[PDB]
Amino acid sequence: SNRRLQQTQAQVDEVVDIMRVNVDKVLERDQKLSELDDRADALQAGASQFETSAAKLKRKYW
Amino acid sequence: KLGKLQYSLDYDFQNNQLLVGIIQAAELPALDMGGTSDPYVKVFLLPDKKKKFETKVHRKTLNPVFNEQFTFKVPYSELGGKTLVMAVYDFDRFSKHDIIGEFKVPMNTVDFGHVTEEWRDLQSAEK
Amino acid sequence: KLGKLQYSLDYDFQNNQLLVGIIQAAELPALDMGGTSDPYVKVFLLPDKKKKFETKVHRKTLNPVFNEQFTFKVPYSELGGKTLVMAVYDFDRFSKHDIIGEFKVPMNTVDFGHVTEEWRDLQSAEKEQEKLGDICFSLRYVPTAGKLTVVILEAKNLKKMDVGGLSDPYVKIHLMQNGKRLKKKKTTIKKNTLNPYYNESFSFEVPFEQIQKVQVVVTVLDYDKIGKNDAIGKVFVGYNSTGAELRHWSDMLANPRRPIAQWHTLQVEEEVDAMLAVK
Amino acid sequence: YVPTAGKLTVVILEAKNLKKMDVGGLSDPYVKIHLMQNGKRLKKKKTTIKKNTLNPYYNESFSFEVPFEQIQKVQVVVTVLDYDKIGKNDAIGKVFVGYNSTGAELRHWSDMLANPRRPIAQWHTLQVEEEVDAMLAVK
Amino acid sequence: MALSEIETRHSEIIKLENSIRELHDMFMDMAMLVESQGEMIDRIEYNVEHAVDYVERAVSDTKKAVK
Amino acid sequence: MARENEMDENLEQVSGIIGNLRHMALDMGNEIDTQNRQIDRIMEKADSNKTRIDEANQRATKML
Amino acid sequence: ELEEMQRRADQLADESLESTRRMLQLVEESKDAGIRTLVMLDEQGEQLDRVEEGMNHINQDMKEAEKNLKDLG
Ligand SMILES: [Mg+2]
Ligand SMILES: [Mg+2]
Ligand SMILES: [Mg+2]
Ligand SMILES: [Mg+2]
């Protein structure tokens, strides 16, 4: 019964076509996550600086 | 302080209708005896208060999950100047159903094209 | 300890048939009144239990001599992956004929070419769990919000429930406390499947102060439209749980804001419900 | 327990701080020993009845025929009860050691196993009959 | 049938095995990438929580400073 | 025919497993998409707060 | 020629068989890899949610700080 063989083959091909797209989307996710990582590091750096300045200002105007 | 609300929003251009999905709500304040309220959400188009849609009443949960969907047959041109209202109500069998919260969404701030779905903090309704 | 068994084995290539000869047995333990048992040997091909051959019943001897012969019309190619079973039975006129012993011979260890004939010590016949099914799911609990996320992933090797076919499984989840069934959930019904895949998430409101006093009961059942729906298997995790279940629970506790997936072996509902009626 | 002869020697020594069962006075305690398996009560033994005592002293030995092949599948149930002539005799407390046992009980059991041809004495805390019997109905 | 039918059967079967293998490798790569990205998210959340702490303390200080 | 049938059973099981793999791939991809949208949101908010905190820090150090 | 032909046919049969077995193993590995992948997706998802709540908190706090700095100036 070649019908089942070829049908299963078509299933496999379909799932492959799904998975490669999924993989590319995952790569895009890796890019976005990396940039988010850099942005977060910069964010916490600025946060610490602003915290220090806030300490000075509290020790000034109170 | 009442809690947050997760909802979904998107527009079907094939049928020219607005698809508003009420996913769930969280951290709602308790107003009933058992320590939990009986919440249900009323949703309607903000511009005209006609044909308001109400969800099913959930018993005694401060984290109700509705997962319901409503359709507003409104053209895409009129949609831009139309707002959405989602208000959370507390059910009471022997008295007026007190409003827990409300939320308004301008359709000019909404971006259609990708299926939108977000959490937004509830606020106290205006007198 | 029962005794030994002398048998003969050889293959006739001219007729393409296996020649199994039962010579005799010795030092068999006595199970009958007179001080001697009534032994008879059942011999059949190990691979498929079809057309089993039985010897004549000898009266009251612990050293029976059968000197009988049996022929298994089996090709030489199929023979290699076929085993031989010789089990010694005790005859009783008014009850079930108890098995005295048994012996299995792999046909890949057997060397044909010379006529084989040997004595082999008898051993006690094997009587494991019947279900042999497993259910896999993930547990996630974050203590702050008190949310319990039970995601039914997938079951495998489930017991057949339908006649001449696979089963129609569905997962029912109960949440118990002090013997009471609080919440009731269920999944989609996957029809005709040996290994059902659901990937369905459920959430429960469980406070941090009662986390050590809750029971999570996962049950895999079969679905027929007509009549009562039977049950394939069930397992429980949480309060008064043991084994890999308590382990998975402790992993859920030790790892907050993170879901841990694990497999579990299905137990009979009687024992489980007997455990849940405790305390 | 000595594995060779399969003899189990349970010697009831003494109870203490038992719950009052009689009105305006001490209790009349006696020890009943059951040997269970698969939920069935096989052997039944009991001791002498010590009257009006806060801490009953028995020092009474009992022996049971337990094969070495079933040592991991036996239940020993010790019950302290109160004795009134008239009517049903109530129960003060009960504990069990052996199959499906936990706590200091399983410990004492394991000490009996690890130390053959030698008796190990130990104390045990009395539990309610409901929970214990609920544990014995398991498996 | 014949040897042609068996040969074509065998060929298409091998083809299926290779497609299956590619699918497999794709799943493996998937799990890999998702894991590494998981570690990335770990350090992101770390930096974020630190930032939150710093911001909170800063806000407290300014709030006490103005009044 | 036993050789052939045995193989047939194998191919059927492979078929079922492949179907399940399809479903899993769909769920996987979908959730990946939604999470990507969420990440976009996160970077928008993070850039917003970055600007907020830079301007605020400058204004704060200005009064020093 | 004939014997070698029959043996060839049976050979191809066996080869295809063990091939299908290899397929079963491969789709099993694929299956499990997929499962753990989904698990990772759930975990990292919740982590992303916590990140979002973090961002919101930061926004509100910096809004208040902005208010105080505008009240001080
Ligand atoms: Mg009410
Ligand atoms: Mg007899
Ligand atoms: Mg059925
Ligand atoms: Mg008395």
Author numbering:
A (entry chain A): 28 to 89
B (entry chain 1): 141 to 267
C (entry chain 3): 141 to 267, 550 to 701
D (entry chain 4): 563 to 701
E (entry chain B): 190 to 256
F (entry chain D): 140 to 203
G (entry chain C): 10 to 82
Task: Please share text taken word for word from the publication where this structure appeared.
Using cryo-electron microscopy (Cryo-EM), we obtained 10 Å resolution reconstruction of the Syt1–SNARE complex on lipid membranes in the presence of Mg2+. This structure, derived from a helical crystal formed by covalently linked Syt1–SNARE protein applied to lipid tube surface, reveals that the Syt1 C2B domain concurrently binds both the SNARE proteins and the negatively charged membranes on diametrically opposite surfaces. So, we used a protein construct wherein the minimal C2AB domains of Syt1 (Syt1C2AB) are covalently linked to the SNARE complex, which was proven to be successful in 3D crystal formation. The optimum composition was found to be DOPS: GalCer at 80:20 ratio, which vastly improved both the overall frequency and quality of the helically organized Syt1C2AB-SNARE coated tubes. Helical indexing of the representative tube defined the Syt1C2AB-SNARE arrangement on the surface as 14,−4 start helix with a helical rise (Δz) of 7.35 Å and a helical twist (Δφ) of 78.48°. The resulting 3D reconstruction at 10.4 Å resolution showed protein decoration on the tube surface with prominent rod-like features (SNARE proteins) arranged almost parallel to the tube axis and with globular structures (C2 domains) attached to the membrane surface. The crystal structures were unambiguously docked into the EM map and showed SNAREpins arranged in an antiparallel fashion with membrane-distal C-terminal interaction. The Syt1 protein located between the SNARE complex and membrane surface, with the C2B domain interacting with the middle portion of SNARE complex. Relative position of C2B over the SNAREs was very similar to the recently described ‘primary’ binding site, involving the t-SNARE helices. The linker between the C2A and C2B domains was fully extended, with the C2A domain locating close to but not interacting with the N-terminal end of the same SNAREpin.
The proteins involved are known and well-characterized. This includes the SNARE (Soluble N-ethylmaleimide−sensitive factor attachment protein receptor) proteins (VAMP2, Syntaxin, and SNAP25) that catalyze synaptic vesicle (SV) fusion, as well as chaperones Munc13, Munc18, and regulators Complexin and Synaptotagmin1–4. Syt-1 is anchored in the SV by a transmembrane domain (TMD), which is connected to tandem cytosolic C2 domains (C2A & C2B) via a 60-residue flexible linker. Both C2 domains are eight stranded anti-parallel beta sandwiches with one calcium sensing region consisting of two aliphatic loops containing Aspartic acid (Asp) residues that bind Ca2+16–18 These conserved Asp residues coordinate Ca2+ with the acidic lipids, like phosphatidylserine (PS) and phosphatidylinositol 4, 5-bisphosphate (PIP2), to facilitate the membrane insertion of the flanking aliphatic loops. In addition, the C2B domain has a conserved poly-lysine motif that binds to PS/PIP2 headgroups to mediate Ca2+-independent membrane interaction.
